Amino acid sequence: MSAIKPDMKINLRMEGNVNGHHFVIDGDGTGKPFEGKQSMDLEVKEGGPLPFAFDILTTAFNRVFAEYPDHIQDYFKQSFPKGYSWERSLTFEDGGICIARNDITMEGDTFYNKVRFHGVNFPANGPVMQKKTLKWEPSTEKMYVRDGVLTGDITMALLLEGNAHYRCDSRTTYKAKEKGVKLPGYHLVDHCIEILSHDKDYNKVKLYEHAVAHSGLPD
Amino acid sequence: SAIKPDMKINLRMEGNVNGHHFVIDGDGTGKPFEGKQSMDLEVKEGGPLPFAFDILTTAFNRVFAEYPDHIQDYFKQSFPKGYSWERSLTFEDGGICIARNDITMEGDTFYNKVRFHGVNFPANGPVMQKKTLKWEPSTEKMYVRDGVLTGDITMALLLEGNAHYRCDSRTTYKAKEKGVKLPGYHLVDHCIEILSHDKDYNKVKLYEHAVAHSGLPDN
Amino acid sequence: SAIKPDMKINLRMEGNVNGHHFVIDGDGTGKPFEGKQSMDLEVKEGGPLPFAFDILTTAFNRVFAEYPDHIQDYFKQSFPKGYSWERSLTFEDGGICIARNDITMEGDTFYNKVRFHGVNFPANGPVMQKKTLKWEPSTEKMYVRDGVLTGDITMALLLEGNAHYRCDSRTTYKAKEKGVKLPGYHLVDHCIEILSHDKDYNKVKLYEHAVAHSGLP
Amino acid sequence: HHMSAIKPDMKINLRMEGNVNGHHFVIDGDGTGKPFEGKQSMDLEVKEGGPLPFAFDILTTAFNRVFAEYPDHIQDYFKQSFPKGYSWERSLTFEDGGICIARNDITMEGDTFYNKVRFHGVNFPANGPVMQKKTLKWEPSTEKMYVRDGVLTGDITMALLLEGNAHYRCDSRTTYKAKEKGVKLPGYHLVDHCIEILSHDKDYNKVKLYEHAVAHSGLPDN
Ligand SMILES: O=S([O-])[O-]
Numbered sequence: 001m002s003a004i005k006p007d008m009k010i011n012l013r014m015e016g017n018v019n020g021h022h023f024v025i026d027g028d029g030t031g032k033p034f035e036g037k038q039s040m041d042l043e044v045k046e047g048g049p050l051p052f053a054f055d056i057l058t059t060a061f062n063r064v065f066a067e068y069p070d071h072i073q074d075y076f077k078q079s080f081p082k083g084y085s086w087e088r089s090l091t092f093e094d095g096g097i098c099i100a101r102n103d104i105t106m107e108g109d110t111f112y113n114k115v116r117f118h119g120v121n122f123p124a125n126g127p128v129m130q131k132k133t134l135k136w137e138p139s140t141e142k143m144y145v146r147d148g149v150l151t152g153d154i155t156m157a158l159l160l161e162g163n164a165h166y167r168c169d170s171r172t173t174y175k176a177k178e179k180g181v182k183l184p185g186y187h188l189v190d191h192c193i194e195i196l197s198h199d200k201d202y203n204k205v206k207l208y209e210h211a212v213a214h215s216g217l218p219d
Numbered sequence: 220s221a222i223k224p225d226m227k228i229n230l231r232m233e234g235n236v237n238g239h240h241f242v243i244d245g246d247g248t249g250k251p252f253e254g255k256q257s258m259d260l261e262v263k264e265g266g267p268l269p270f271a272f273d274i275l276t277t278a279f280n281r282v283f284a285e286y287p288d289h290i291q292d293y294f295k296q297s298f299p300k301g302y303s304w305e306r307s308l309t310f311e312d313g314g315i316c317i318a319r320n321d322i323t324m325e326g327d328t329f330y331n332k333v334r335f336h337g338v339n340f341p342a343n344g345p346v347m348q349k350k351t352l353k354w355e356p357s358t359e360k361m362y363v364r365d366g367v368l369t370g371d372i373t374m375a376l377l378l379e380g381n382a383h384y385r386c387d388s389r390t391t392y393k394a395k396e397k398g399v400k401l402p403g404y405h406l407v408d409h410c411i412e413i414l415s416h417d418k419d420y421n422k423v424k425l426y427e428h429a430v431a432h433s434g435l436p437d438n
Numbered sequence: 439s440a441i442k443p444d445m446k447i448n449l450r451m452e453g454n455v456n457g458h459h460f461v462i463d464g465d466g467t468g469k470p471f472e473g474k475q476s477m478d479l480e481v482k483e484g485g486p487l488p489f490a491f492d493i494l495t496t497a498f499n500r501v502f503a504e505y506p507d508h509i510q511d512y513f514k515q516s517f518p519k520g521y522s523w524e525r526s527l528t529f530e531d532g533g534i535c536i537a538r539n540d541i542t543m544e545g546d547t548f549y550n551k552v553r554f555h556g557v558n559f560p561a562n563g564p565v566m567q568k569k570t571l572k573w574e575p576s577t578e579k580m581y582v583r584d585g586v587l588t589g590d591i592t593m594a595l596l597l598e599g600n601a602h603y604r605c606d607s608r609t610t611y612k613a614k615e616k617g618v619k620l621p622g623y624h625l626v627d628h629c630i631e632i633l634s635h636d637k638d639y640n641k642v643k644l645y646e647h648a649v650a651h652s653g654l655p
Numbered sequence: 656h657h658m659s660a661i662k663p664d665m666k667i668n669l670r671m672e673g674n675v676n677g678h679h680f681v682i683d684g685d686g687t688g689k690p691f692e693g694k695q696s697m698d699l700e701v702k703e704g705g706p707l708p709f710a711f712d713i714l715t716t717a718f719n720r721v722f723a724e725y726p727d728h729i730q731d732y733f734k735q736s737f738p739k740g741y742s743w744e745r746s747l748t749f750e751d752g753g754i755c756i757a758r759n760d761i762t763m764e765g766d767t768f769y770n771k772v773r774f775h776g777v778n779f780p781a782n783g784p785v786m787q788k789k790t791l792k793w794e795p796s797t798e799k800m801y802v803r804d805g806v807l808t809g810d811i812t813m814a815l816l817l818e819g820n821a822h823y824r825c826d827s828r829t830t831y832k833a834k835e836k837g838v839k840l841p842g843y844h845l846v847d848h849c850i851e852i853l854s855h856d857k858d859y860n861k862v863k864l865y866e867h868a869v870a871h872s873g874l875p876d877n
């Protein structure tokens with residue numbers, strides 16, 4: 001009924017603008033939806049070398065790639081073959097604010113991702129514009145229904161140079177394309193995201209993510 | 220200098236709110252030294268808008284603000300070359316927009332290249348249900364933050380049923396030419412009004428009046 | 439008629455910021471219809487204060503605001519019985535304060551029982567460092583929310599070296615008597631100033647000027 | 656770095672004083688816990704200000720991260736802050752504008768932790784879930800722990816389940832400060848927790864509270 005395969009391809013085009021700098025980024029990769037794992041090779045096609053930390057873009061580069069236990073409704077795998085969309089705001093602690101969206105379709109073995117990313121008000125000598133970010137720290141998304149819609153709320157942190165941290169408050173709304181996909185109960189999604197390799201300027205990046213859904217303590 | 224007592228305003232806005240793409244053209248006139256401006260707005264692509272027009276109206280130029288002699292006018296000093304702004308709008312129910320405008324002048328006309336993106340407006344909130352009446356009069360705080368002129372404001376939309384709907388906005392302004400003198404802390408009063416519109420807001424007449432001041436007791 | 443042209447102000451504040459307990463007494467005067475008040479303040483306990491005195495000053499009465507005829511004056515209408523307010527103050531570096539005042543009146547004097555609690559001010563921040571100079575003049579936005587008069591404001595402290603330090607504040611205002619008529623949306627301009635102080639701010643003279651208006655046009 | 660004097664089975668003595676929306680209260684607490692298992696229970700009694708006119712649930716995170724199960728590889732700032740103790744300050748920012756701040760000064764004598772807790776809150780809307788007592792429980796959540804401004808900081812966005820099944824968000828920031836010098840600061844880590852009112856009398860004048868807390872490194876090392 002769902003047509004989600006153990007191994008899937010990922011096609012992606014991201015376009016957007018941060019701090020007035022336009023960019024286009026293409027991604028091709030593979031994932032294991034039932035294992036909650038995915039990888040992607042990315043190439044900056046326009047606007048390279050990027051004047052900002054590549055790390056701010058990486059959560060925009062699909063919750064279908066999360067390991068869901070049987071006892072939790074898997075909204076994302078239940079959304080196919082028709083697919084779904086998400087919208088997200090990223091509010092950073094120094095006033096940098098980004099909005100993003102992805103329209104996700106599926107054709108055969110391949111997920112297609114139309115991603116948009118817009119960012120404003122990053123300070124000139126902040127860690128984003130100065131490329132002082134090292135990685136996203138592992139974090140946990142809270143999944144719950146708000147105004148008829150599945151919503152993911154998370155506070156994430158970028159590890160910085162010198163082992164400082166840089167806070168980002170994120171809210172995502174997820175919407176199945178097909179009418180009447182059953183919404184899940186409150187649950188948690190643990191994730192980690194990692195740049196596996198990159199060239200000096202981050203014109204080429206190999207990206208990986210692992211995500212696991214769960215009910216949290218006590219079980 | 221470059222600024223004439225009567226100016227023309229040419230504007231194109233392209234954007235996306237809650238997944239809905241749109242294009243809006245603006246043609247108008249204003250008196251920069253009196254801080255007054257009007258515009259006729261025409262929805263080109265994406266009419267009729269599925270969301271409240273009111274969210275867009277602050278994005279449709281601080282050059283049209285009455286500055287007293289004791290306050291540095293950053294905006295009139297930015298011309299002929301012009302300036303750009305970036306803005307975030309954080310609404311109380313989680314809706315978040317980002318906007319930008321690159322402002323140029325040739326002859327007696329200001330040209331505005333405007334982008335507007337918004338996400339996470341609830342289906343039954345006042346924006347998607349078109350339950351807003353107007354922006355209440357407000358006061359923007361201008362000050363320098365990380366080497367850039369920053370405008371901070373809490374605005375409120377009046378709703379049908381008389382409730383108020385809070386928006387927190389931050390704008391950064393940047394002159395194109397190097398070495399334009401940054402002002403000291405000041406305030407800008409403003410009021411914005413949709414003078415007329417057709418049923419579906421595919422046509423809108425918009426007016427704004429803005430006045431800079433020192434605050435109490437010097438205002 | 440409860441509001442006289444020249445009134446006195448009695449005040450006791452107690453609180454705790456970043457673990458440090460303090461008591462501060464105030465005695466002042468003002469002109470309710472001119473929207474002007476000043477007060478002499480004295481630290482009775484916990485002096486010298488280890489934090490910037492400025493964080494407390496908006497907690498040291500909107501009855502002292504010049505209201506024009508066309509705006510309902512919730513505050514002067516709340517007397518002789520009084521009103522109370524509650525306020526949260528969210529500073530941009532995570533320092534968060536909450537405050538309360540219960541205001542009563544007898545003759546020509548307002549009595550104020552004030553509480554002020556603050557946490558999470560960083561040691562390297564302007565408050566614990568005492569790098570504040572003044573509150574910049576600001577505009578509070580007054581509207582009804584869930585049946586209660588509410589004031590929302592973005593305020594900013596001028597810092598040494600002319601940086602600013604932002605504070606977001608929400609106040610809820612509550613008349614003691616039933617049937618005090620709620621105003622419509624309006625703005626209140628204010629400026630607050632420490633006029634004089636001794637070295638450690640154990641004694642402080644404070645001044646405020648406030649004016650209600652509709653805004654443009 | 657040193658021996659904590661923390662025993663496998665500990666007693667907990669607590670007094671909370673506070674004021675929410677102008678309402679003053681005193682609440683006494685007596686419990687027990689297993690520091691190394693990350694588990695604790697407490698019986699709470701309202702001594703002044705009963706019956707409480709707001710949701711008891713807003714207070715329950717205020718009623719000690721000693722009671723967290725720490726792996727060997729993550730520095731345990733809380734157990735290493737003993738025998739001398741530590742204190743925390745916390746802000747609670749609810750989505751409808753209610754704001755609380757809280758403090759706890761934590762000491763130890765023999766097998767007993769002592770807790771001097773202060774809790775103040777303002778601007779809870781009269782018709783909101785807190786003042787209307789429409790909360791059900793805190794959902795399980797994960798706190799992020801890292802060093803900020805030289806201080807161990809816990810940042811968490813938590814949710815109260817409401818009647819009618821909506822959720823009610825609270826953004827909480829805690830700063831933790833050891834009383835003694837020389838307590839090693841931990842690197843970034845996560846703490847999973849669950850908090851539960853096991854039982855209560857009708858007006859919540861008497862409450863039985865339980866919590867389980869587990870620190871980990873997150874994915875993949877969890
Ligand atoms: O996917 S994790 O390894 O960042």
Ligand SMILES: O=S([O-])[O-]
Nearest residue numbers: 410411412427428
């Ligand atoms: O711009 S004013 O007339 O609302």
Ligand SMILES: O=S([O-])[O-]
Nearest residue numbers: 629630631646647
């Ligand atoms: O009252 S003003 O001048 O600080």
Ligand SMILES: O=S([O-])[O-]
Nearest residue numbers: 849850851866867
């Ligand atoms: O403490 S747990 O059982 O919610």
